[PDB]
Ligand binder design. Structure first.
Ligand SMILES: N[C@H](CCC(=O)N[C@@H](CS)C(=O)NCC(=O)O)C(=O)O
Ligand SMILES: N[C@H](CCC(=O)N[C@@H](CS)C(=O)NCC(=O)O)C(=O)O
Ligand SMILES: [Cl-]
Ligand SMILES: [Cl-]
Lengths: 200, 198
């Protein structure tokens, strides 16, 4: 809706996973195109760039019909605004954005470690986990929202962050109860639960 | 929640400059509060005195309301003052271009500020990304999105204004991008800001 949405990315979670989580949450049907399923992802990406008119030669790429959408954050924000999971006020829209940008700071650090340890594990992670803990405390019953009294993409971003972190470091939410409960809450959402338990 | 707008940052362009350019362009009166007395000490006191979410600047204080994160502040400011995008998809493209600016600005900052080898940026990043922005301007026939100025126009301007502080004549092979930068720089409010800027 549509009517044919194609997400282009490598065979990984990475920069596309939050877009996939947003699609799963909103029940948006789409083609999840992944480079590397058909053997060589490097050649398939090279061919993709010739085929599709990408503005920055990067993925994820969201294609809506002939419409080419690039940049994870821009796509996430575009989808969240279109389907009203960005905040129930002008200021709440900002807070979701602020939190999302904060996620990007600590997620980048995780990406730089996981994909490309000491500094992250001892200095960045616990400090930034404290930041989000305090932000939940500010706003927080089985519901855990970072913004207002409804789900924002910020919730899904923080969930994706620590879900991505907890694949490499499982015990990282032990000392952060609200963040742990937020993870549990988001992971068990009707639309979210099925996607995460059934994804590769 | 109102009146007194105060921007907190270091005495540098960095992550607050675009916000400063946006205030300048819009003609918004604000206190441009810059750290450093001792910057490192003042910032330590700032964190103790202000309730920042991530212990980072820029911080935008509107009354007693605390705003953090450059991009979020920029996007908030653009919506409130109507330099956000003149449609739903125009807002996306502005955001996309802004996100593109961040990708290459980050690469510039790594070499310009954090002592990374300049060659990779100069030979591999800068001209490739300048070509991306050049092509995006070509698609819009200066303005990146729509028929009016968006924050994306100021973001691109800020990007290459920052780049030219260390690497002048980088827009020689990029006429549309060079003319875009020159058009934004000659806007009365921007022109005035640049002249007063140290
Ligand atoms: N600005 C990022 C871009 C993500 C990114 O760096 N994409 C990588 C994924 S491996 C890519 O397609 N790289 C292309 C290349 O290295 O040339 C976003 O949020 O979309
Ligand atoms: N996510 C960035 C954060 C900017 C940032 O990294 N701020 C630096 C400026 S030097 C800072 O306050 N550093 C925190 C510290 O090192 O304690 C944003 O757009 O606001
Ligand atoms: Cl990544
Ligand atoms: Cl910077």
């Amino acid at each position: 809706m549509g009517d044919n949405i194609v997400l282009y990315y490598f065979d990984a979670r990475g920069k596309a996973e939050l877009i996939r989580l947003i699609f799963a949450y909103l029940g948006i049907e789409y083609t999840d195109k992944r480079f590397g399923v058909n053997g060589d992802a490097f050649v398939e990406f090279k061919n993709f760039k010739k085929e599709k008119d990408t503005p920055f030669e990067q993925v994820p790429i969201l294609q809506i019909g002939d419409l080419i959408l690039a940049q994870s954050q821009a796509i996430v924000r575009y989808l969240s605004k279109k389907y009203n999971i960005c905040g129930e006020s002008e200021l709440n829209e900002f807070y979701a954005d602020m939190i999302f940008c904060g996620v990007q700071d600590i997620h980048y650090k995780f990406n730089n470690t996981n994909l490309f340890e000491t500094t992250f594990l001892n200095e960045d992670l616990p400090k930034w986990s404290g930041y989000f803990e305090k932000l939940l405390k500010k706003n927080h019953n089985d519901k855990y929202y970072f913004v207002g009294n409804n789900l924002t993409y910020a919730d899904l971003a923080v969930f994706n962050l620590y879900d991505d972190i907890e694949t490499k470091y499982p015990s990282s939410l032990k000392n952060f109860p609200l963040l742990k409960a937020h993870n549990e809450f988001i992971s068990n959402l009707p639309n979210i639960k099925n996607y995460i338990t059934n994804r590769k």
